[PDB]
Amino acid sequence: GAYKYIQELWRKKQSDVMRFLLRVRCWQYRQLSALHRAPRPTRPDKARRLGYKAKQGYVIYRIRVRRGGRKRPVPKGATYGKPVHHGVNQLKFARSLQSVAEERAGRHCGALRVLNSYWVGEDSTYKFFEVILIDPFHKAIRRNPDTQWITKPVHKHREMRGLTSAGRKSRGLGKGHKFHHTIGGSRRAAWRRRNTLQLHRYR
Amino acid sequence: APSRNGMILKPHFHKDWQRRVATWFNQPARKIRRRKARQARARRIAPRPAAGPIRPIVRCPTVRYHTKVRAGRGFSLEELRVAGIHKKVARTIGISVDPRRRNKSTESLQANVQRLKEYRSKLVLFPRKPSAPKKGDSSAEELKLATQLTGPVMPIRNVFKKEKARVITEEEKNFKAFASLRMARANARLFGIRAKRAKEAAEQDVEKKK
Amino acid sequence: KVPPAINQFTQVLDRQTATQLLKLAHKYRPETKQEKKQRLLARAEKKAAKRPPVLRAGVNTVTTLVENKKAQLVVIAHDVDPIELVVFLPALCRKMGVPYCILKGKARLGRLVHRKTCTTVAFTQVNSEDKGALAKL
Amino acid sequence: YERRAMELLKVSKDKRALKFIKKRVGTHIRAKRKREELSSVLAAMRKAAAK
RNA sequence: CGCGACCUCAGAUCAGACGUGGCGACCCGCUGAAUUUAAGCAUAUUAGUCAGCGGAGGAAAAGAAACUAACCAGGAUUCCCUCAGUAACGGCGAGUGAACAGGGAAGAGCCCAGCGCCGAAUCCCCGCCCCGCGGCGGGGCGCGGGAAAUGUGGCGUACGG
RNA sequence: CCCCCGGCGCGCCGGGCCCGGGUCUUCCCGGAGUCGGGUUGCUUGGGAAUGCAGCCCAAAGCGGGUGGUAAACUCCAUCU
């Protein structure tokens, strides 16, 4: 179809057609609210690749997330400790801003369930994304066997455990020699299993 | 402060290990529950073997074990494609498959298809419906000889060849094994510089004439 | 300065030729849920005792058959919200030698079928009498 | 940055153009790979300009 | 200017649904110290540890390779034994410190988008029939309403199709 | 001895259900402000930076990732 034609266009962000159209929506979203609903995906090729099926029950929310890094919340610096922990200004956050975007939408719209998000526009002071939520209690979602996995109670608040594509990136889990410090389930699980004493019965 | 003589200990007990001591009082109780579930899994698929699907012959890497044979994860497709059995059929009759495997040699590939032909010989297949024997089923008199197979089916044995006594030849008496090693240790190591010094001879020849 | 690959969507076809082309398109409308139902009862009754050329809505139907060069005329809507979904297609049918015209509004173009909106409609084949009606267009 | 690179291609400052793209696109192999492609489209511009 | 779509966007005590909050021993995401040790101390150690924050489930997470290896190669995850207090990190001081291979317990694999092919071949809700109805479900009848061509259903996923 | 409860098949009916393997010819095939590079901060046994992120740059397709010392060329292996 035409999606592959749209696919290679969106990889041309520096081109004049994209450099224009990106700055329109970036201007357009910047006059809107911080958290609101979009009727249809503005980036449809990236939607269906992430699992968006255009039907009743698929609702998307386009939010704006503040640019930059994170600074330590302490009055006048207030780190009554060693020079290692006086660092307050050039600190960075652990989770990606795309994962923070799925939090603010998922937490506020706790009636729905998060699936995936994607980049739609950038500014020096903001960072815009369109998260794809799902409705757990519409029969068009409930009756299709491919998507009834959402309704299971372990898929409540995937944005709070980081089970999304943005969520799975920041935990740093994967296969290979590079992720030895998270062999097991989690970075907490690897450390826990590495620091217990196995007091055998016969030692 | 250490005494007169001893060792240097670096005991990694400086964290709060007391809070994370996992004791092993489950071990006699865990073996009770495990075998009970291992018997429940047994009686659940009772005519099928308790060992589960077959595991292929597999060589293991890391040259310390490269002369050993393990139990594989599953038969590769090129082990099953020439076997005459499609991969989405062999799962139904107890043949573990995983497609990621390779067979860069042939002797392992032929030995495993040898293991499936004899497994296909041993296989007593029930009819789909009790009133009709299908084309690939076992005959009725073999159903009475169908019970549960304990232990790993067709166990892998790391057997070896016997070598009969032979008379030593004269070349083998003149054979310098260790002197061949250090000569070969030179040949493999100095292969690069001999490949390099072979290249500049030509340019110092062509400018002599031209 | 609007880039010219989307500036080409204010350069749209006029009033009077949009009348005839939709009049030409008021004859190849798709079978509805009823006209499918009144199609299937007609084929199922001949079970007991070939299709005419119809249009193609949507870009996923169109962009395939333009690559197979099966289209004879392409109708375009100009006011899609993601304009990127259409921007390639005028520059594509030029390289495919397929004639394309742009029409103002997707809603009046959306009423050829009984849906809300339609971005692209194709003329792949026609009737025998409807040959000089398009060859002048 | 590519249109800035073709100016280095028409003045044929290739040793500087490769350094220019390497500071733009990343490692040497990618900057190499794009580089000959961009003189291949200039030659595709040079083939139409004549006739 | 009248009207008709559509596009956005409101507002309802609209029809029907849904979320908050408690426990938190065990699990997941962030945050995150300092007493302590170094005979002082600032890196380090303490320690990704307590305190704080969120969200779960009866298990969680992880999981079917952008893998390990360098062999005659193994082949998702999790868990135990060993690797091993080893390679490596560190005022190379204090201390810290994994992984592959192997033996085990367990054993299980598969769906999309895209690609095109099917005349959107699909779906919700209301009216109706039957049948069960304390998991409101199936089947058929409704030019009933709607969703969807800015892409639903079927075929099909890298082992190729 | 008496209830309750599922299980297990066995029979009745509403049902959806036309599907496979092999040879040959000929077409098709992949996820992007993401990989990746720079720099800063934290983390790691990971040491000319293992993992995470912020900011700048910003992809390619016989390409890309990995092949624990930086870089260039050369072959390979190995996944997608």
Short mmCIF file of all heavy atoms in Angstrom, two decimals, chain A residues 1 3 40 48 53-55 85 143 171 175 177 184 188 191, chain E residues 34 45 48-49 62 68 76 78 114 116 124 150-153:
data_model
loop_
_atom_site.label_atom_id
_atom_site.label_comp_id
_atom_site.label_asym_id
_atom_site.label_seq_id
_atom_site.Cartn_x
_atom_site.Cartn_y
_atom_site.Cartn_z
N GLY A 1 0.80 -1.21 0.00
CA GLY A 1 0.00 0.00 0.00
C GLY A 1 0.84 1.26 0.00
O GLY A 1 1.92 1.29 -0.57
N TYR A 3 1.70 2.95 2.94
CA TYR A 3 2.34 3.18 4.23
C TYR A 3 3.85 3.22 4.10
O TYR A 3 4.52 4.02 4.76
CB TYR A 3 1.91 2.11 5.22
CG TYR A 3 0.48 2.25 5.67
CD1 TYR A 3 -0.46 1.27 5.40
CD2 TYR A 3 0.07 3.37 6.38
CE1 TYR A 3 -1.76 1.40 5.82
CE2 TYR A 3 -1.24 3.51 6.80
CZ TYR A 3 -2.15 2.52 6.51
OH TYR A 3 -3.45 2.64 6.93
N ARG A 40 -7.67 11.23 15.64
CA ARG A 40 -7.09 10.25 14.74
C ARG A 40 -5.57 10.40 14.78
O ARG A 40 -5.06 11.47 15.14
CB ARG A 40 -7.61 10.45 13.31
CG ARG A 40 -7.24 11.77 12.69
CD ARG A 40 -7.94 11.96 11.36
NE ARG A 40 -9.39 11.92 11.50
CZ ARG A 40 -10.16 10.95 11.03
NH1 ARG A 40 -9.61 9.92 10.40
NH2 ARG A 40 -11.47 11.00 11.20
N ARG A 48 0.25 1.79 13.32
CA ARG A 48 -0.07 0.39 13.08
C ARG A 48 1.15 -0.50 13.28
O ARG A 48 1.01 -1.69 13.58
CB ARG A 48 -0.63 0.22 11.68
CG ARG A 48 -1.60 1.31 11.31
CD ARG A 48 -1.73 1.42 9.81
NE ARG A 48 -1.96 0.12 9.17
CZ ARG A 48 -3.11 -0.55 9.21
NH1 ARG A 48 -4.16 -0.06 9.85
NH2 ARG A 48 -3.21 -1.72 8.59
N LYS A 53 -4.89 -0.48 15.87
CA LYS A 53 -5.90 -0.94 14.93
C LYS A 53 -7.02 0.08 14.94
O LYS A 53 -7.61 0.34 15.99
CB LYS A 53 -6.42 -2.33 15.30
CG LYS A 53 -5.39 -3.43 15.15
CD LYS A 53 -4.77 -3.41 13.77
CE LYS A 53 -5.73 -3.98 12.73
NZ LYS A 53 -5.84 -5.45 12.84
N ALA A 54 -7.31 0.66 13.78
CA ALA A 54 -8.32 1.71 13.73
C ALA A 54 -9.71 1.11 13.89
O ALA A 54 -10.30 0.63 12.93
CB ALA A 54 -8.22 2.48 12.41
N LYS A 55 -10.23 1.15 15.11
CA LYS A 55 -11.56 0.65 15.42
C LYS A 55 -12.02 1.31 16.71
O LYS A 55 -11.29 2.09 17.32
CB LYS A 55 -11.58 -0.88 15.52
CG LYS A 55 -10.77 -1.43 16.67
CD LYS A 55 -10.72 -2.94 16.59
CE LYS A 55 -10.04 -3.37 15.29
NZ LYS A 55 -10.32 -4.78 14.91
N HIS A 85 27.96 13.72 46.28
CA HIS A 85 26.52 13.91 46.19
C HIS A 85 26.11 15.38 46.20
O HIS A 85 24.91 15.68 46.29
CB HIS A 85 25.80 13.16 47.30
CG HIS A 85 26.06 11.69 47.31
ND1 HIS A 85 26.85 11.08 48.26
CD2 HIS A 85 25.65 10.71 46.47
CE1 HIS A 85 26.90 9.79 48.01
NE2 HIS A 85 26.18 9.54 46.93
N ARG A 143 -13.83 -9.08 22.50
CA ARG A 143 -14.22 -10.28 21.78
C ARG A 143 -13.18 -10.75 20.76
O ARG A 143 -13.18 -11.94 20.42
CB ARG A 143 -15.56 -10.08 21.08
CG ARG A 143 -16.73 -10.00 22.05
CD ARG A 143 -17.96 -9.45 21.38
NE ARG A 143 -19.07 -9.31 22.32
CZ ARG A 143 -20.23 -8.73 22.01
NH1 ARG A 143 -20.41 -8.23 20.80
NH2 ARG A 143 -21.19 -8.64 22.91
N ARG A 171 14.97 0.19 31.41
CA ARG A 171 15.42 -0.82 32.37
C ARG A 171 16.73 -1.46 31.96
O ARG A 171 17.39 -2.07 32.80
CB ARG A 171 14.36 -1.90 32.53
CG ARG A 171 12.94 -1.38 32.67
CD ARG A 171 11.94 -2.48 32.43
NE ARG A 171 11.81 -3.35 33.60
CZ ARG A 171 11.14 -4.50 33.61
NH1 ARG A 171 10.55 -4.93 32.50
NH2 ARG A 171 11.07 -5.21 34.72
N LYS A 175 19.52 -9.39 25.95
CA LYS A 175 20.42 -10.52 25.76
C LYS A 175 21.79 -10.01 25.36
O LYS A 175 21.92 -8.97 24.71
CB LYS A 175 19.88 -11.46 24.69
CG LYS A 175 18.75 -12.35 25.13
CD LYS A 175 18.57 -13.46 24.12
CE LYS A 175 17.57 -14.49 24.58
NZ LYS A 175 16.19 -13.95 24.60
N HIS A 177 26.34 -10.04 26.25
CA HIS A 177 27.31 -9.81 27.31
C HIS A 177 27.19 -8.41 27.90
O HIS A 177 27.68 -8.18 29.00
CB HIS A 177 28.72 -10.01 26.78
CG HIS A 177 29.09 -9.05 25.69
ND1 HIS A 177 28.58 -9.14 24.42
CD2 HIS A 177 29.91 -7.97 25.70
CE1 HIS A 177 29.08 -8.16 23.68
NE2 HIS A 177 29.88 -7.44 24.44
N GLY A 184 18.63 -12.34 34.86
CA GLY A 184 17.57 -12.62 35.80
C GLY A 184 16.29 -11.96 35.33
O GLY A 184 15.95 -12.04 34.15
N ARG A 188 17.31 -5.10 39.92
CA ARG A 188 17.17 -5.43 41.33
C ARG A 188 17.25 -6.93 41.57
O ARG A 188 17.80 -7.36 42.58
CB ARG A 188 15.83 -4.90 41.85
CG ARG A 188 15.57 -5.14 43.32
CD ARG A 188 16.60 -4.44 44.17
NE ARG A 188 16.76 -3.05 43.77
CZ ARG A 188 16.12 -2.03 44.35
NH1 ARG A 188 15.29 -2.25 45.36
NH2 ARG A 188 16.33 -0.80 43.92
N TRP A 191 20.98 -8.18 41.31
CA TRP A 191 21.75 -7.80 42.49
C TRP A 191 21.35 -8.63 43.70
O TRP A 191 22.18 -8.95 44.55
CB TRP A 191 21.54 -6.32 42.78
CG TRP A 191 22.26 -5.84 43.98
CD1 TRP A 191 23.51 -5.31 44.02
CD2 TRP A 191 21.78 -5.86 45.32
NE1 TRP A 191 23.84 -4.98 45.30
CE2 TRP A 191 22.79 -5.31 46.13
CE3 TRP A 191 20.60 -6.28 45.92
CZ2 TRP A 191 22.65 -5.17 47.50
CZ3 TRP A 191 20.46 -6.14 47.28
CH2 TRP A 191 21.48 -5.59 48.05
P A E 34 26.17 10.43 51.54
OP1 A E 34 26.90 11.44 50.74
OP2 A E 34 26.26 9.00 51.15
"O5'" A E 34 26.61 10.57 53.05
"C5'" A E 34 25.93 11.48 53.90
"C4'" A E 34 25.65 10.87 55.24
"O4'" A E 34 24.54 9.95 55.15
"C3'" A E 34 26.76 10.03 55.82
"O3'" A E 34 27.79 10.83 56.39
"C2'" A E 34 26.03 9.15 56.83
"O2'" A E 34 25.80 9.84 58.04
"C1'" A E 34 24.68 8.94 56.13
N9 A E 34 24.59 7.63 55.48
C8 A E 34 24.84 7.28 54.19
N7 A E 34 24.67 6.01 53.95
C5 A E 34 24.29 5.49 55.17
C6 A E 34 23.97 4.20 55.60
N6 A E 34 23.97 3.15 54.79
N1 A E 34 23.63 4.03 56.89
C2 A E 34 23.63 5.09 57.70
N3 A E 34 23.92 6.35 57.42
C4 A E 34 24.25 6.48 56.13
P U E 45 32.39 2.12 45.75
OP1 U E 45 32.09 1.02 44.80
OP2 U E 45 31.56 3.35 45.75
"O5'" U E 45 32.35 1.52 47.22
"C5'" U E 45 33.23 0.47 47.58
"C4'" U E 45 33.33 0.32 49.07
"O4'" U E 45 33.92 1.51 49.64
"C3'" U E 45 32.01 0.17 49.80
"O3'" U E 45 31.49 -1.13 49.73
"C2'" U E 45 32.38 0.61 51.21
"O2'" U E 45 33.06 -0.43 51.90
"C1'" U E 45 33.38 1.73 50.93
N1 U E 45 32.75 3.07 50.96
C2 U E 45 32.53 3.65 52.19
O2 U E 45 32.81 3.12 53.24
N3 U E 45 31.95 4.89 52.16
C4 U E 45 31.59 5.59 51.04
O4 U E 45 31.07 6.70 51.17
C5 U E 45 31.85 4.93 49.80
C6 U E 45 32.41 3.73 49.81
P G E 48 25.85 -2.05 45.47
OP1 G E 48 25.13 -3.22 46.03
OP2 G E 48 27.29 -2.16 45.15
"O5'" G E 48 25.08 -1.52 44.18
"C5'" G E 48 23.69 -1.78 43.98
"C4'" G E 48 22.80 -0.85 44.78
"O4'" G E 48 23.09 0.54 44.42
"C3'" G E 48 21.30 -1.03 44.58
"O3'" G E 48 20.63 -0.79 45.82
"C2'" G E 48 20.96 0.08 43.60
"O2'" G E 48 19.61 0.49 43.59
"C1'" G E 48 21.87 1.19 44.11
N9 G E 48 22.11 2.25 43.14
C8 G E 48 22.21 2.13 41.78
N7 G E 48 22.39 3.28 41.18
C5 G E 48 22.40 4.21 42.21
C6 G E 48 22.55 5.61 42.18
O6 G E 48 22.72 6.35 41.20
N1 G E 48 22.49 6.16 43.45
C2 G E 48 22.30 5.45 44.60
N2 G E 48 22.27 6.17 45.73
N3 G E 48 22.15 4.14 44.65
C4 G E 48 22.21 3.59 43.43
P U E 49 19.13 -1.32 46.06
OP1 U E 49 19.01 -2.66 45.45
OP2 U E 49 18.23 -0.22 45.64
"O5'" U E 49 19.00 -1.45 47.63
"C5'" U E 49 19.69 -2.47 48.34
"C4'" U E 49 20.03 -2.01 49.72
"O4'" U E 49 21.31 -1.32 49.70
"C3'" U E 49 19.07 -0.99 50.30
"O3'" U E 49 17.92 -1.57 50.86
"C2'" U E 49 19.94 -0.24 51.30
"O2'" U E 49 20.08 -0.99 52.50
"C1'" U E 49 21.29 -0.23 50.58
N1 U E 49 21.50 1.01 49.80
C2 U E 49 21.81 2.18 50.47
O2 U E 49 21.90 2.26 51.68
N3 U E 49 22.00 3.27 49.68
C4 U E 49 21.93 3.32 48.31
O4 U E 49 22.13 4.39 47.74
C5 U E 49 21.63 2.08 47.68
C6 U E 49 21.43 1.00 48.43
P A E 62 9.11 -7.83 31.65
OP1 A E 62 9.40 -6.56 30.94
OP2 A E 62 7.83 -8.53 31.38
"O5'" A E 62 10.28 -8.86 31.33
"C5'" A E 62 11.62 -8.57 31.67
"C4'" A E 62 12.46 -9.82 31.64
"O4'" A E 62 12.04 -10.70 32.71
"C3'" A E 62 12.31 -10.65 30.38
"O3'" A E 62 13.16 -10.21 29.35
"C2'" A E 62 12.61 -12.06 30.86
"O2'" A E 62 14.01 -12.25 30.97
"C1'" A E 62 12.03 -12.03 32.27
N9 A E 62 10.63 -12.50 32.31
C8 A E 62 9.52 -11.72 32.49
N7 A E 62 8.40 -12.39 32.51
C5 A E 62 8.81 -13.70 32.34
C6 A E 62 8.09 -14.89 32.28
N6 A E 62 6.76 -14.94 32.38
N1 A E 62 8.78 -16.03 32.10
C2 A E 62 10.12 -15.96 32.00
N3 A E 62 10.91 -14.89 32.05
C4 A E 62 10.18 -13.78 32.22
P U E 68 26.61 -12.25 22.76
OP1 U E 68 27.07 -11.26 23.76
OP2 U E 68 26.90 -12.04 21.32
"O5'" U E 68 27.18 -13.67 23.18
"C5'" U E 68 27.09 -14.11 24.53
"C4'" U E 68 27.36 -15.59 24.66
"O4'" U E 68 26.54 -16.34 23.72
"C3'" U E 68 28.77 -16.06 24.36
"O3'" U E 68 29.67 -15.83 25.43
"C2'" U E 68 28.56 -17.54 24.06
"O2'" U E 68 28.38 -18.26 25.27
"C1'" U E 68 27.22 -17.51 23.32
N1 U E 68 27.38 -17.50 21.85
C2 U E 68 27.73 -18.68 21.22
O2 U E 68 27.92 -19.73 21.81
N3 U E 68 27.86 -18.61 19.86
C4 U E 68 27.68 -17.50 19.08
O4 U E 68 27.83 -17.60 17.86
C5 U E 68 27.32 -16.32 19.79
C6 U E 68 27.18 -16.37 21.12
P A E 76 18.49 -21.89 24.51
OP1 A E 76 19.63 -21.26 25.24
OP2 A E 76 17.89 -23.14 25.02
"O5'" A E 76 17.30 -20.85 24.45
"C5'" A E 76 17.45 -19.63 23.75
"C4'" A E 76 16.45 -18.61 24.19
"O4'" A E 76 15.11 -19.11 23.96
"C3'" A E 76 16.45 -18.26 25.67
"O3'" A E 76 17.50 -17.40 26.06
"C2'" A E 76 15.06 -17.66 25.84
"O2'" A E 76 15.00 -16.35 25.30
"C1'" A E 76 14.24 -18.59 24.95
N9 A E 76 13.71 -19.70 25.74
C8 A E 76 14.14 -21.00 25.81
N7 A E 76 13.44 -21.74 26.65
C5 A E 76 12.51 -20.86 27.17
C6 A E 76 11.47 -21.01 28.11
N6 A E 76 11.18 -22.15 28.73
N1 A E 76 10.73 -19.93 28.41
C2 A E 76 11.01 -18.79 27.79
N3 A E 76 11.95 -18.52 26.89
C4 A E 76 12.67 -19.61 26.63
P U E 78 17.16 -15.39 32.69
OP1 U E 78 17.78 -14.08 32.97
OP2 U E 78 17.97 -16.50 32.13
"O5'" U E 78 16.44 -15.93 34.00
"C5'" U E 78 15.34 -15.24 34.55
"C4'" U E 78 14.50 -16.15 35.41
"O4'" U E 78 13.90 -17.18 34.58
"C3'" U E 78 15.25 -16.93 36.48
"O3'" U E 78 15.46 -16.16 37.65
"C2'" U E 78 14.36 -18.13 36.70
"O2'" U E 78 13.27 -17.78 37.55
"C1'" U E 78 13.81 -18.38 35.30
N1 U E 78 14.56 -19.42 34.57
C2 U E 78 14.31 -20.74 34.88
O2 U E 78 13.51 -21.08 35.73
N3 U E 78 15.02 -21.66 34.17
C4 U E 78 15.95 -21.40 33.19
O4 U E 78 16.51 -22.35 32.64
C5 U E 78 16.15 -20.02 32.91
C6 U E 78 15.47 -19.10 33.59
P G E 114 -0.46 -3.06 7.39
OP1 G E 114 -1.31 -1.98 6.84
OP2 G E 114 -0.96 -4.46 7.33
"O5'" G E 114 0.96 -3.00 6.67
"C5'" G E 114 1.72 -1.80 6.67
"C4'" G E 114 3.18 -2.07 6.42
"O4'" G E 114 3.68 -3.07 7.35
"C3'" G E 114 3.52 -2.65 5.06
"O3'" G E 114 3.57 -1.67 4.04
"C2'" G E 114 4.85 -3.33 5.31
"O2'" G E 114 5.90 -2.37 5.37
"C1'" G E 114 4.64 -3.88 6.71
N9 G E 114 4.14 -5.27 6.67
C8 G E 114 2.90 -5.70 7.07
N7 G E 114 2.73 -6.98 6.91
C5 G E 114 3.93 -7.41 6.38
C6 G E 114 4.33 -8.71 6.01
O6 G E 114 3.68 -9.76 6.08
N1 G E 114 5.63 -8.72 5.51
C2 G E 114 6.44 -7.62 5.40
N2 G E 114 7.66 -7.84 4.89
N3 G E 114 6.07 -6.40 5.74
C4 G E 114 4.82 -6.37 6.23
P G E 116 2.91 -3.38 -1.61
OP1 G E 116 3.79 -2.23 -1.95
OP2 G E 116 1.87 -3.22 -0.56
"O5'" G E 116 2.17 -3.88 -2.92
"C5'" G E 116 0.86 -4.43 -2.85
"C4'" G E 116 0.90 -5.94 -2.84
"O4'" G E 116 1.23 -6.41 -1.52
"C3'" G E 116 -0.41 -6.63 -3.17
"O3'" G E 116 -0.62 -6.71 -4.57
"C2'" G E 116 -0.25 -7.99 -2.51
"O2'" G E 116 0.46 -8.89 -3.35
"C1'" G E 116 0.62 -7.66 -1.29
N9 G E 116 -0.12 -7.62 -0.01
C8 G E 116 -0.22 -6.54 0.83
N7 G E 116 -0.91 -6.79 1.90
C5 G E 116 -1.28 -8.12 1.78
C6 G E 116 -2.05 -8.94 2.64
O6 G E 116 -2.57 -8.66 3.73
N1 G E 116 -2.19 -10.22 2.14
C2 G E 116 -1.66 -10.65 0.95
N2 G E 116 -1.91 -11.93 0.64
N3 G E 116 -0.95 -9.90 0.14
C4 G E 116 -0.79 -8.65 0.60
P C E 124 -19.27 -7.40 17.61
OP1 C E 124 -19.09 -8.58 18.49
OP2 C E 124 -20.17 -7.50 16.44
"O5'" C E 124 -19.75 -6.16 18.50
"C5'" C E 124 -18.84 -5.50 19.36
"C4'" C E 124 -19.18 -4.04 19.50
"O4'" C E 124 -19.07 -3.39 18.22
"C3'" C E 124 -20.60 -3.74 19.95
"O3'" C E 124 -20.77 -3.85 21.35
"C2'" C E 124 -20.83 -2.33 19.41
"O2'" C E 124 -20.22 -1.37 20.26
"C1'" C E 124 -20.04 -2.37 18.10
N1 C E 124 -20.89 -2.67 16.92
C2 C E 124 -21.62 -1.64 16.34
O2 C E 124 -21.55 -0.50 16.82
N3 C E 124 -22.40 -1.90 15.26
C4 C E 124 -22.45 -3.13 14.76
N4 C E 124 -23.23 -3.34 13.70
C5 C E 124 -21.72 -4.20 15.33
C6 C E 124 -20.96 -3.93 16.40
P U E 150 -8.95 7.19 3.24
OP1 U E 150 -9.99 8.25 3.26
OP2 U E 150 -7.87 7.22 2.24
"O5'" U E 150 -8.27 7.16 4.68
"C5'" U E 150 -7.08 6.40 4.89
"C4'" U E 150 -6.41 6.76 6.19
"O4'" U E 150 -6.17 8.19 6.22
"C3'" U E 150 -7.20 6.43 7.45
"O3'" U E 150 -6.30 6.03 8.49
"C2'" U E 150 -7.83 7.77 7.82
"O2'" U E 150 -8.14 7.90 9.19
"C1'" U E 150 -6.73 8.74 7.40
N1 U E 150 -7.22 10.08 7.09
C2 U E 150 -6.70 11.10 7.84
O2 U E 150 -5.88 10.92 8.72
N3 U E 150 -7.18 12.35 7.53
C4 U E 150 -8.11 12.65 6.57
O4 U E 150 -8.43 13.83 6.41
C5 U E 150 -8.60 11.53 5.82
C6 U E 150 -8.15 10.31 6.11
P G E 151 -5.77 4.52 8.56
OP1 G E 151 -5.62 4.15 9.99
OP2 G E 151 -4.60 4.41 7.67
"O5'" G E 151 -6.96 3.65 7.96
"C5'" G E 151 -8.01 3.17 8.80
"C4'" G E 151 -8.35 1.73 8.52
"O4'" G E 151 -8.62 1.57 7.10
"C3'" G E 151 -7.27 0.72 8.86
"O3'" G E 151 -7.87 -0.49 9.32
"C2'" G E 151 -6.59 0.48 7.52
"O2'" G E 151 -5.94 -0.77 7.41
"C1'" G E 151 -7.76 0.59 6.56
N9 G E 151 -7.38 1.06 5.23
C8 G E 151 -6.38 1.95 4.95
N7 G E 151 -6.26 2.20 3.68
C5 G E 151 -7.25 1.43 3.08
C6 G E 151 -7.61 1.30 1.72
O6 G E 151 -7.10 1.85 0.73
N1 G E 151 -8.67 0.42 1.55
C2 G E 151 -9.30 -0.24 2.56
N2 G E 151 -10.29 -1.05 2.19
N3 G E 151 -8.98 -0.13 3.84
C4 G E 151 -7.95 0.72 4.02
P U E 152 -7.16 -1.36 10.46
OP1 U E 152 -7.07 -0.54 11.69
OP2 U E 152 -5.93 -1.95 9.87
"O5'" U E 152 -8.19 -2.54 10.75
"C5'" U E 152 -9.11 -2.45 11.82
"C4'" U E 152 -10.34 -3.28 11.55
"O4'" U E 152 -10.96 -2.82 10.33
"C3'" U E 152 -10.10 -4.76 11.31
"O3'" U E 152 -9.96 -5.50 12.51
"C2'" U E 152 -11.31 -5.17 10.49
"O2'" U E 152 -12.44 -5.36 11.32
"C1'" U E 152 -11.55 -3.91 9.65
N1 U E 152 -10.95 -4.02 8.30
C2 U E 152 -11.67 -4.69 7.33
O2 U E 152 -12.76 -5.18 7.55
N3 U E 152 -11.07 -4.75 6.10
C4 U E 152 -9.85 -4.23 5.75
O4 U E 152 -9.44 -4.36 4.60
C5 U E 152 -9.16 -3.55 6.80
C6 U E 152 -9.72 -3.47 8.01
P G E 153 -9.02 -6.80 12.55
OP1 G E 153 -9.05 -7.33 13.94
OP2 G E 153 -7.74 -6.47 11.89
"O5'" G E 153 -9.76 -7.86 11.62
"C5'" G E 153 -10.94 -8.51 12.05
"C4'" G E 153 -11.48 -9.43 10.99
"O4'" G E 153 -11.87 -8.66 9.83
"C3'" G E 153 -10.50 -10.45 10.44
"O3'" G E 153 -10.35 -11.58 11.27
"C2'" G E 153 -11.10 -10.76 9.08
"O2'" G E 153 -12.22 -11.63 9.22
"C1'" G E 153 -11.60 -9.39 8.65
N9 G E 153 -10.59 -8.67 7.87
C8 G E 153 -9.82 -7.63 8.29
N7 G E 153 -9.00 -7.20 7.37
C5 G E 153 -9.26 -8.01 6.28
C6 G E 153 -8.68 -8.02 4.99
O6 G E 153 -7.79 -7.29 4.54
N1 G E 153 -9.22 -9.01 4.18
C2 G E 153 -10.20 -9.88 4.58
N2 G E 153 -10.60 -10.76 3.65
N3 G E 153 -10.76 -9.88 5.78
C4 G E 153 -10.24 -8.93 6.57
#
